[PDB]
Amino acid sequence: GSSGSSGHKPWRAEYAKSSRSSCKTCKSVINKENFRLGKLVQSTHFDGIMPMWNHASCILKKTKQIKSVDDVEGIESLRWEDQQKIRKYVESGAGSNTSTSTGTSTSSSGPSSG
Numbered sequence: 656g657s658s659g660s661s662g663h664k665p666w667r668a669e670y671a672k673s674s675r676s677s678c679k680t681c682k683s684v685i686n687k688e689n690f691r692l693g694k695l696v697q698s699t700h701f702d703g704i705m706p707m708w709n710h711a712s713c714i715l716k717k718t719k720q721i722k723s724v725d726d727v728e729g730i731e732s733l734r735w736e737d738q739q740k741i742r743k744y745v746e747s748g749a750g751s752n753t754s755t756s757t758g759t760s761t762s763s764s765g766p767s768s769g
């Protein structure tokens with residue numbers, strides 16, 4: 656795919672228009688009409704960006720994920736309650752019950768089929 660829009664937000668916000676995608680944090684299906692989050696990670700090799708699809712609640716529960724609501728794209732399209740989950744997460748100490756962990760464990764990361 657071709658494009659030309661300098662600058663790209665790390666996180667994305669938009670209601671899933673399908674139920675084919677499956678979260679990575681919980682490894683479940685993301686039914687359409689739901690608020691999810693996609694962690695865009697640029698690569699050095701030649702390959703279409705891989706948006707890490709994860710329930711908006713699967714990420715917010717984690718720590719050191721989002722810096723500010725400004726980093727989230729399309730966040731203005733999300734429902735009020737949803738938009739709050741972001742700002743109310745980036746402003747306040749990410750995570751609850753002081754539950755902080757270094758990223759996520761490794762799961763056969765490599766030969767992943769698909």
Ligand SMILES: [Zn+2]
Nearest residue numbers: 678681710713
């Ligand atoms: Zn999930």
